[PDB]
Write a protein that binds this ligand. Sequence first.
Ligand SMILES: [Mg+2]
Ligand SMILES: [Mg+2]
Ligand SMILES: [Mg+2]
Ligand SMILES: [Mg+2]
Ligand SMILES: [Mg+2]
Ligand SMILES: [Mg+2]
Ligand SMILES: [Mg+2]
Ligand SMILES: [Mg+2]
Ligand SMILES: [Mg+2]
Ligand SMILES: [Mg+2]
Ligand SMILES: [Mg+2]
Ligand SMILES: [Mg+2]
Ligand SMILES: [Mg+2]
Ligand SMILES: [Mg+2]
Lengths: 213, 75, 175, 168, 159
Amino acid sequence: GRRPARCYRYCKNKPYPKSRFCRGVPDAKIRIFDLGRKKAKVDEFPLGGHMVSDEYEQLSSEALEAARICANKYMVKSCGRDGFHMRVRLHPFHVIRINKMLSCAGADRLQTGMRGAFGKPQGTVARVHIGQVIMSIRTKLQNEEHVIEALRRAKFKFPGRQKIHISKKWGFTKFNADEFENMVAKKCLIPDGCGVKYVPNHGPLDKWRVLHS
Amino acid sequence: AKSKNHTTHNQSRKWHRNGIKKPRSQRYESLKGVDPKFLRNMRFAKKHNKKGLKKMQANNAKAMSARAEAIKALV
Amino acid sequence: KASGTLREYKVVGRCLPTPKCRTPPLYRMRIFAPNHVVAKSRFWYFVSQLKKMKKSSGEIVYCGQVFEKSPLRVKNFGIWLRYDSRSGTHNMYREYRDLTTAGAVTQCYRDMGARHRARAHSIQIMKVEEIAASKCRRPAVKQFHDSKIKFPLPHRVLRRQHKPRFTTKRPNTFF
Amino acid sequence: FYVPAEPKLAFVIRIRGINGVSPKVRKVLQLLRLRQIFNGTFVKLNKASINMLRIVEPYIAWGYPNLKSVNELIYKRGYGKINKKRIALTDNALIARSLGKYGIICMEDLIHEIYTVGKRFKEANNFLWPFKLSSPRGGMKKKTTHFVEGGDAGNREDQINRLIRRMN
Amino acid sequence: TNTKGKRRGTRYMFSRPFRKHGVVPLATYMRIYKKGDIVDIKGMGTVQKGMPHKCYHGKTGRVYNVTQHAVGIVVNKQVKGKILAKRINVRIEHIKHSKSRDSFLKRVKENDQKKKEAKEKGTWVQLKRQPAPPREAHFVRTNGKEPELLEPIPYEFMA
RNA sequence: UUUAUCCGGUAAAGCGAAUGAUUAGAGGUCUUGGGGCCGAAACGAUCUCAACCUAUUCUCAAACUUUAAAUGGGUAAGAAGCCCGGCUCGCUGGCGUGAGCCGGGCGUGGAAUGGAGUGCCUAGUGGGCCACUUUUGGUAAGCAGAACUGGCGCUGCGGGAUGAACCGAACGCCGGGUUAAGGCGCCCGAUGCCGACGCUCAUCAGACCCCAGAAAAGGUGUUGGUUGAUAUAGACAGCAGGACGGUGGCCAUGGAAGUCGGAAUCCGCUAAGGAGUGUGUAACAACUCACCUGCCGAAUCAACUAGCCCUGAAAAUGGAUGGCG
RNA sequence: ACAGAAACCUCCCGUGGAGCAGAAGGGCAAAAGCUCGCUUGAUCUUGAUUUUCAGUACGAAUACAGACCGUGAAAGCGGGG
RNA sequence: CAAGCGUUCAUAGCGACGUCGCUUUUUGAUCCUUCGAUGUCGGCUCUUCCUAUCAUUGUGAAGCAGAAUUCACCAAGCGUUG
RNA sequence: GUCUACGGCCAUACCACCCUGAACGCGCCCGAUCUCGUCUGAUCUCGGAAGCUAAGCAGGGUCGGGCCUGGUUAGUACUUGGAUGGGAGACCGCCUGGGAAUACCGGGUGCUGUAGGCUU
Ligand SMILES: [Mg+2]
Ligand SMILES: [Mg+2]
Ligand SMILES: [Mg+2]
Ligand SMILES: [Mg+2]
Ligand SMILES: [Mg+2]
Ligand SMILES: [Mg+2]
Ligand SMILES: [Mg+2]
Ligand SMILES: [Mg+2]
Ligand SMILES: [Mg+2]
Ligand SMILES: [Mg+2]
Ligand SMILES: [Mg+2]
Ligand SMILES: [Mg+2]
Ligand SMILES: [Mg+2]
Ligand SMILES: [Mg+2]
């Protein structure tokens, strides 16, 4: 199946992205990077819970798979099938290699050892830096503890270590949460489904004329 | 019977033991390499400097006696 | 950075004048170090973290010791902290009950070493501040903290165990 | 406030020996004339000089000498380079015999040009043969690390005089 | 092993910089060079005739020859030690006037001037350059404020 | 090394900048579709999914790049240089250019160091190895392969118990002094400091760069913090009373009247009782827990975080912080 | 008009997203691309230099000079691509 | 870690998706040692040692009533055949 | 103030739209006899001078896109040297020096060269 994540834990070799230069890559295991009610609004989910890495390491595609599922399962739960949104923010992008298992039959007669040591693609892997986010969840301010425990269970599908952190942003935006309501009325910010559009004092005046009209 | 394939390992030491020498440049370097139509002319300029040495010699005494007069008028 | 007995070398310094701004501001920090040369150097470590200023583009104006105004009167020092543990970096408040601000953080540097194995290069002193009787949270300091203070010295071991290295009388430990 | 003058004179000692030393390091240290371990020279502080001490800082220990430190070095351990010889400065007819063309005539006139850096520091501090100082009585702190982290290397403003007592 | 090809690895060197692909500006072939003048070679992709070779790209050298649209030029090229003063033929599009020379000849025109004058006086002027000296003790004056107190700020995990 | 001055496409960064990947929604019959559902059909309505694109957003690139370092590579810092005067030309041209010559006129041109230049013969070598950092294969190697410097080979000495290569330091033969890296209970020179301040007790203690041993995960073992709690309107804990009524509530009946499970789902007595934490009972009951009381008199509680010690922790001639301890 | 996602014609937009015999990489717009007319600089001849480098060859290339020409009003360009 | 199996019930016994290790009784990789040769498979015999315990002593667990049986702990004393 | 001819540096000059152009010129414009070229006097070549600023061009305008420059991001990312620093390791801290890039905020929007006009 696959070597234990031990061997592909450290970022040794330069990124090997899937391109015309390596082909035949087995399709990444994890597929769906966000679930829950991705049809939510910004105005009804103010809790940016994060799971932040603390080590410069790799994350296997199949790990991001279980870490998502086991968080979907302590969520829809205490929260309910509508009361959250889960984001995976690491797309397995760098291709991991395997010298061809040094396959032999019986005892052996020959393997060539190391001639053409360069190996095949085996799977995919995410590159993670210190202080870079892996998963992020958003719910109501009511439901804080259940974001903490759902991310606390996903830590156990990951190598290394990672701190759980609750953000000062509003949901998934980049805007400090003490300021949202102020920048919504007077329209420094305009609801755009999940995200939100920052409208500056830059463009044509008619672009304003739509707002404050 | 595999072997090392290359290295520049202590080479910096070797060619700096006698201290890499910027090429010693003299005045009057060689004209070899200059385009022939230059030389084919400048050799005629050099070959007939003498025809016209009388002008040069008398006109030298003119300024030599005018500046022997210029340094004596200062005196 | 290393230690000794720490001292309160306060420093001020400006970013030396360019043609555009001719009178830059002055900054005094309460740097806290064993002599001049390192008290100058701990300055540029803290001003480079706060201002866009370097040892090249600046100059120290005044370096001089500030020495305790009440050295014969015991005081309660709280001191806010920030160090670097093996995992992250954490903030603290700790209390020490000695009678000189310098010695009070000489004690603190000894504890982060003793209780957290944090060497001096990891620690940052936010601000030392002497406190009144109340406002003291640590009961390790809060216990002396009275009038009719009273101990015996119960199990008083003898040093001088190598003055006479051989003796007839077994020692005593009660006094 | 007052900002005293940037020191113009700094007396540099080498504090680590000679093996396992970088290429660029080894060139500087033979321009400061700190060839053998543990000797010292008066370098004149200057944008180019200062930027040569930065580059050999893990090897040296320099600082701003005071007057008594200048005397001690020049008298007790002061030898003059005459005819490419380390000749002891026993009488001052040896100093005038080399430096008389600069108004320097005596043991005391040398010290002017060494303290108040002066017009002739180039010839004064190049007829002085590098001072060969003993080991530091009492020991160093850490030959490897820099002064600021409890070591011995690099610059120590004005604290170098304690290092010149125990090393004369 | 790698290939000896004349233009290997120049993928990024001879490339016209950005938003400049096109007609060579006509100034670059209407400034004059005469023997002795110092020149810094800098290749260029658009003109391929008369290109230099990548080991001279970035190097300076004096001029010794001038043909109709090229310039013979002597540079130094270091090879495993011994430096060889070798002369190459480079069309003008890959050449500039190096102002490296021109700081001096302006210190010269000024030195020669400041010596002819102040000679009728006899007052000796500082002709030599001199490196940046110690910064010359001064005063600082705060007027009516004490300095601003700086404190290292308490850490908090941003993310 | 400064002072000028060119050269650079790596780290980083960016992808709302090209190229290449790629997530999400909002926006769009853009186009169009393939299924639908309501339509005979209808850009009709409502969906849907596909592909595109209008503002956005998540994440990437060694063989991508708007940007863009650090270290680094060139030159230049004068006498072979400037400034005048004049001759020569088969080149160049409306004249002049340009170069070449002769003749005069003028000196320390950044810091620091050191005597420089040049020619002959020529031995040995052409298996290399290691370490910091960078880095290519490989899962990894005391593996294979590069860069940069340093070593070892070619080289002893002090130190690391022992030891090519680590740390100090490079050896003419000696007397005195003093150090470096290391040390200073005993082996074993040196603490036979009246040394500071703490931490930890191990039925597997711990005990020093290379180096020779351990992980996730735990642990009211103890010590510090961090944050949030609770409280003289008397808590916490302990010992006493209730924990009900509207109510076999509703779904589910196979039994769920509170309780295998779920939509839920609030009032009355209120002091307080959740249409219920569980024990269980086919279901209750009975018991209990939230919740609230009775008694007591002041600090208590919870989640995290880190230090040390414990768990995790299993190998073979007896046994190795060098030993003793 | 027959004519449909594709024939042909016309306008508008079009920094290159095409093309430049081939691998890629650079370079290219009243061009180096495409279409025409005229052609043989793919010719004869010394040297100098670059590239691999020992700073030897071979190959390939870069500037010139001397002839004979091609082309264009011409400046120029051209001794294979 | 825990989604699940176990009538009910995560953890009696189990345990997916993941993840951290030990081990040198497997095979590999590698080529440091030996090519002026270390006798290169098994079986026979004989000793000793390890515990990653199959039995027996003492025990805690069970979806342990008894019987039987799995799970675990101190444990290598003595066994382990024709 | 401005244009025309030939330009240099090549967006502070571009692009999109909006408004105003006195006189000289630039242009649109009117013809195909000759010169020349086309399937076509559409372009090119030529002979013109009846009209008009409709457009190019010039000049402005836009909380305009772009570019040009500053600020911030940030002494952050990264890095030259250094340690018998930390950490099982990944990596991380400090000392000695150098020091970026977006998003986000500001400001600017062609400078001139020679020769000739016009505003006499
Ligand atoms: Mg050494
Ligand atoms: Mg070292
Ligand atoms: Mg490159
Ligand atoms: Mg051999
Ligand atoms: Mg010819
Ligand atoms: Mg062609
Ligand atoms: Mg079940
Ligand atoms: Mg080998
Ligand atoms: Mg034998
Ligand atoms: Mg056991
Ligand atoms: Mg017409
Ligand atoms: Mg118009
Ligand atoms: Mg108009
Ligand atoms: Mg704009």
